[PDB]
């Protein structure tokens, strides 16, 4: 008898009114999870953060989909945020594997 009702919200160029409307609609909806899937944002900021903070205000898990910045990896601030795309730091492990393959020790990281 478990029922699933689907609710999604659109885009607005601003972020204060976007966050306000999102918080009001999700509070009125009593959702369990939040999904954000905007890779090609015209703004290069890549900021779904206020939704995650407001969800952490009630410890509501958030699962990211697009952004791979390591700022979301910090659970001390992002207390209720997850994602299924690993950050670029795993490319560091990939480069370590490459170093294992080709026997390279000294690098010049910039």
């Amino acid at each position: 008898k478990i029922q699933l009702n689907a609710t999604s919200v659109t885009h607005k160029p601003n972020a204060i009114q976007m966050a306000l409307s999102v918080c009001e609609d999700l509070i009125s909806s009593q959702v369990y999870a939040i999904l954000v899937s905007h890779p090609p944002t015209p703004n290069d900021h890549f900021t779904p953060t206020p939704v995650s903070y407001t969800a952490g205000f009630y410890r509501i898990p958030v699962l990211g989909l697009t952004t791979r910045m390591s700022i979301y990896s910090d659970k001390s601030i992002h207390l209720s945020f997850l994602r299924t795309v690993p950050p670029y730091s795993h490319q560091s492990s990939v480069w370590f594997e490459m170093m294992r393959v080709y026997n390279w020790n000294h690098i010049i990281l910039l």
């Binding site: 601003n14 306000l20 918080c23 206020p50 205000f57 910090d74």
Partner: protein, 410 residues
Amino acid sequence: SIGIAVILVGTSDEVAIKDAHEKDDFHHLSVVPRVELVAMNETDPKSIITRICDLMSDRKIQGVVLADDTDQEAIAQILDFISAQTLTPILGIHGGSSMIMADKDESSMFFQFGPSIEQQASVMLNIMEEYDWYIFSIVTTYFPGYQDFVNKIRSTIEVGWELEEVLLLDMSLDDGDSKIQNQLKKLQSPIILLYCTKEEATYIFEVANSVGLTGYGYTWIVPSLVAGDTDTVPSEFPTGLISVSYDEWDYGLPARVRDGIAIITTAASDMLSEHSFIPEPKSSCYNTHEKRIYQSNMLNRYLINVTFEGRNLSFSEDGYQMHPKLVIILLNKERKWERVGKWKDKSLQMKYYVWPRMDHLSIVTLEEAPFVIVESVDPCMRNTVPCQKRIISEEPGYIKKCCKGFCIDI
């Protein structure tokens, strides 16, 4: 004619603050600030957003002061977003608007009244220096400000200080009480230091009472956030709990309001005099993106250096104050907090010359040339023993010296 907003939520003497609002001497600079006081509730953040929107749209608010009485860090956490997204700076002086979060935004203009983590660590180490207790241990949870505290204490201690146990507890995972009880067996020093949250502190005290590591020979010292409110005492805080809290007794709400108004006014005067221009753009609540054009970029540089005729109210880069006033509290047998000592300007003052306890025998002696040598403390070193000399002129005065000799070696 700057516009200053005062918001009060919870019980407070609003009439007294209003009467004491015009208690500053601002006649030496043409500022004539306008202050509006409004009462609010703790319903939800969106209500606060609406209230500040209305205030800045109507009175053209160039500065917001928030005071409350809750024990939630979310107040400043969300107020940081408003302060960053609005050209008007915001200040917090009391209640939920006082606890320092991790950090403020680069564009943030929000400041708080209180000391930093490192200053509290320094005061706590001064306390451990005052009464000769040099064996300790540190345990904390995954609150963001843990690495700062650990690194600060490690650097400061890097006198025979001996740290032998450091513990990190992750309370997000449940059913870990057995693991916590097993891993608390590593504690061996008589004194253990904790850095967690209030409910987490209660849980940890439950675990400790289950393991019985808090009866007589173990004393705990905790930061300000563990206590927070003196009026309420949690269920099982062990008697003899030591902590340092902001001096909220001799520094009341009207004083905080006057200090905030004065610092805002003098920063605005400095900005409008040194640069001859005061950034007071169109305070538009709707579509704030276009209202951020007149970015000050220097009012913040004039918001971190303020003197109030004796009170150096300068702030730090992270957002905290530079010269806080601190008091120390102790949990006696009955559930209350007593006023034990004061700390100010790297000076520690203790009312009790000896810390009372919750075998031991006192020794009397006299200085003899080869056997008992007494000298003043280092402006005591190794291989010496501290000794107390009473002074009779008032209250019983003692001065600490260093005693050694042939008899002392035996």
